[PDB]
Amino acid sequence: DNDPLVVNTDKGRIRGITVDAPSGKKVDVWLGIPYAQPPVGPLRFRHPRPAEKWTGVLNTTTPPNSCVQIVDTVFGDFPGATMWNPNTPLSEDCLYINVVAPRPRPKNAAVMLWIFGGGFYSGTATLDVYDHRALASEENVIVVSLQYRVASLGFLFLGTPEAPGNAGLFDQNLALRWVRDNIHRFGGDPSRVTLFGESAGAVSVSLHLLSALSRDLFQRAILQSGSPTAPWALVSREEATLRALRLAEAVGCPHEPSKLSDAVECLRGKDPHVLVNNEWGTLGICEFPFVPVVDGAFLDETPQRSLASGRFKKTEILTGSNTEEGYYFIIYYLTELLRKEEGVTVTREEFLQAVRELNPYVNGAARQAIVFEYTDWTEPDNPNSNRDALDKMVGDYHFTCNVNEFAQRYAEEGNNVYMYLYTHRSKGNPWPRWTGVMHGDEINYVFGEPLNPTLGYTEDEKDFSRKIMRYWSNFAKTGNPNPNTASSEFPEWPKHTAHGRHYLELGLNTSFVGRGPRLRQCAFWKKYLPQLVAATSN
Amino acid sequence: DNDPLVVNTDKGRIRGITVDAPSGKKVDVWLGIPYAQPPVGPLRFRHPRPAEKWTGVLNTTTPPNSCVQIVDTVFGDFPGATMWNPNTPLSEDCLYINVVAPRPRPKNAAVMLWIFGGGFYSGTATLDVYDHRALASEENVIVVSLQYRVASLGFLFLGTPEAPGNAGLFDQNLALRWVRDNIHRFGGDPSRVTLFGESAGAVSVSLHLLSALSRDLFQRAILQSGSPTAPWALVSREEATLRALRLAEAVGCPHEPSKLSDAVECLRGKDPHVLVNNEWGTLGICEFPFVPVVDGAFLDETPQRSLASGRFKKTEILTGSNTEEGYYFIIYYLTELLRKEEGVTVTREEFLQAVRELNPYVNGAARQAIVFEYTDWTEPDNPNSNRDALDKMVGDYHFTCNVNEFAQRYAEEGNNVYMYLYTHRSKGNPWPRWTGVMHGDEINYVFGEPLNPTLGYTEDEKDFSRKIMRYWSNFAKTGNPNPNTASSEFPEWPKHTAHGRHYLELGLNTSFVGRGPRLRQCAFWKKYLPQLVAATSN
């Protein structure tokens, strides 16, 4: 065909469509490309099979079905909560890819590949926050995104072939293989694939750097507020086996570790919606029932041992955190304290009880170390500072410091690292003004949501999106976010070197280069408190 | 006599002398006024008796004998060390008072009463650094000072009547009773006696607020680098007996706790220089062999209990610290490392060894907390930063944090407190460059030593001296260092209130107002580490 919209993929022909960006610059899109067999019936829980080849021309004009997942209804139809809720029908047949190329169609352009986040229980590529048209057109890159299986449906583990674990990661892996085989046909370069993700998506990106099966499938990596050394990122084979049995028990299935065939058989027979709804039992803050696991094929060691020994992809990294990571998770957890309303505060007594609840696995002498490290000693009983203390202890432990470990371990092995601290509140932010720069706020600006003027983003926010979109794309192209010839509009992002630990603050009216971020609080979590538990355990 | 230089005291007459203050201005001085029977022979170690009345007119014109103590000759003749050594001849007959009045002679002026410091083992009022002429003449106040017994001669305890303890403080108490009975005859107000001291002199001054015996002998208090809850300020009455028995053992006297009369008798017979030069056995950093004790008369409870209950004088307080309180004591103690020379530094392993030797009583799980709290996580193995960390751990624990606690409890019992942080180096400081603003560095400036034209102080340093001399004298006069009308050259010193905890930075080119200072580091020593040791120690 002389038509550019039709593209001969390795398994068949697909017809795309030309779509207007919100900027007014046209782009070619291909939405809902089948990259794998629908994991249905006996294929549930297992690793994906490549899609059966088709005869004729399939129209890839519609956003695909999202994977079966729970829906966030705790705050009803609250725009800040519902923006992450899935916007396409929930189906087990969710294994699809979306490609968006700029106009005119490039030759061998840099490929930016988005892997979504939702604590490995939720999320989808089809959300409007992940719109590719801005990032593609404004920066001249092939923006790609994929669906992977989430929750128990993508991460059930029993230490058996029929529930081998990491099925969601192998979904991502098979998509990376697809991009390598086919993205050149859409105007991309297979050798310049940059993986970028947020939260569990950023964790996923880090596991792809560590893993052997995906070591030769991409080039560079961006990691927004996530890393493979996070407490929640992985779970042990011993605990993962028990939770699958708990799921079977809760759903009404045979749930004995002696005979594990009977459990999976009926689990595959159950409705996928009742399966996901009965996952959440008694779990603490920021720990998710079904997440990645050290299986043997994808990963054959814990990410710490890979990181300690130095066994990871020798490539550039761009990573970072936000100032208020914890609040989002302490909103959904701790519901009675921290209500979704304006001007909430925490009294010292309420703060003292929260460290017990937010850290239920630590002795008591360790809990004394936590109350000292996270206290505003200028005004110890300040209701606003005590609320802030809760955000930081959760945010540092579960996100910021784990990004720092990963980034610092990449630095002192020779690779160039570029750390950010995202410090900006959107002017019309639906959440309370005390919540600050929450986990996932950066996403709105990296994907060019302010360039859509039908949303009421300011002029400086539009300039700020254009600013960080360049850093992201510049890095994906050449391995440096910095421009070729420096500018006042585009300040210097220095390397996060091992000896220096520098980072660039990302905000409206700044270019402040700090060091860390928050090295003392991370030193607490990663060095001090571990040996304090080791000392006081006996 | 209508001659003004003579004054008929309660025990006789004395004649003073007119002399020039270094500046050029003229003052009346009365040097070596006896206030006690020489504590000689039977009266050694016991509390002082008042002076026997004399006939005629005593020529009170020569500076008094310094009390028996050791001479600092580890560095030989280093000007920075020899300035604290005694400049008048050593004698047991040392219980004298100095009075210096400005001209024209006032009528009912504020009395600024100086108590010196030397770890309760050393010091004298006659030192050229404590030059009263400049202060008196510049601020129009009656500057008074006194000689109190130091070392074992001043503070020996065996729990007997013949060695009751606190003789040095009872010397000060009697000296305060003299100033109350007599200072109206020199032109001073007995009701406006403001005590002021540094190091152990500030401790002394602080205990006078606590004490029942000296409660009604003065008005206000100024406290430089000192506090009654300092670890070195007092020792236990249990320990202090053992200290005396070890001193008796060293000199060759009976050291049997069953028979204490033979010990004190034998000790009374020995030469006073033998006694002082055999006190320093195996004592760690910032802990002195003979210091104050809870006796029953001067103090009938520990300073911590009196602060717990609010049992102290209801008045104003002007207290503070310097930035580098520790180095001075880390130079003399621990001399193999950190020696007296330019550009010295401490490596990580030397820091790790230093924390063991500067805190040898803690259990090791506590050492991990100290190293964590006093390491620069920006650059953990920086030799400069590891050195400064040693200054702080000693400077905080022994000085800064006890000053803060005393100011805090005062502030939150409704008293008007004023906190400072002295941050200024003399331009011609003989000590090394790395030492910074060391312990007792402010004394030269509060006493008006920069106004001496034979010395080479800068004109900015002369202004800075006149600046703080005004604050001090304003406080002594009114209970507030800030001037009435609020001058532009004199910045606002806000009250160190219980809620805010504001302190003024005292430097050349700064009027910076902070919080604390070092509240986080003081919460470590006073809040966290105490409950750690109790958690860990079995």
Ligand SMILES: *[C@@H]1O[C@H](CO)[C@@H](O[C@@H]2O[C@H](CO)[C@@H](O)[C@H](O)[C@H]2NC(C)=O)[C@H](O)[C@H]1NC(C)=O
């Ligand atoms: C989309 O697929 C459908 C069916 O698989 C096709 O839709 C038709 O194609 C042409 C497009 O100009 C028109 O006749 C109608 O829109 C549809 N007619 C019929 C008979 O199906 C088509 O192959 C694909 N879309 C396009 C734009 O080619």
Ligand SMILES: *[C@@H]1O[C@H](CO)[C@@H](O[C@@H]2O[C@H](CO)[C@@H](O)[C@H](O)[C@H]2NC(C)=O)[C@H](O)[C@H]1NC(C)=O
């Ligand atoms: C210091 O004391 C002396 C002796 O009590 C005072 O009297 C002087 O005594 C000497 C004898 O050594 C006579 O030569 C002088 O004439 C006396 N001096 C005066 C001024 O009368 C002496 O007055 C006292 N010192 C001062 C400065 O008055």
Ligand SMILES: *[C@@H]1O[C@H](CO)[C@@H](O)[C@H](O)[C@H]1NC(C)=O
């Ligand atoms: C913010 O920008 C303004 C000029 O637009 C300028 O004052 C400065 O760069 C920033 N403001 C500060 C640092 O107060």
Ligand SMILES: *[C@@H]1O[C@H](CO)[C@@H](O)[C@H](O)[C@H]1NC(C)=O
């Ligand atoms: C204090 O420092 C500032 C720096 O901005 C300078 O302008 C000023 O001249 C300094 N003060 C004096 C008295 O020199």
Ligand SMILES: [Co+2]
């Ligand atoms: Co059962």
Ligand SMILES: [Co+2]
């Ligand atoms: Co013996």
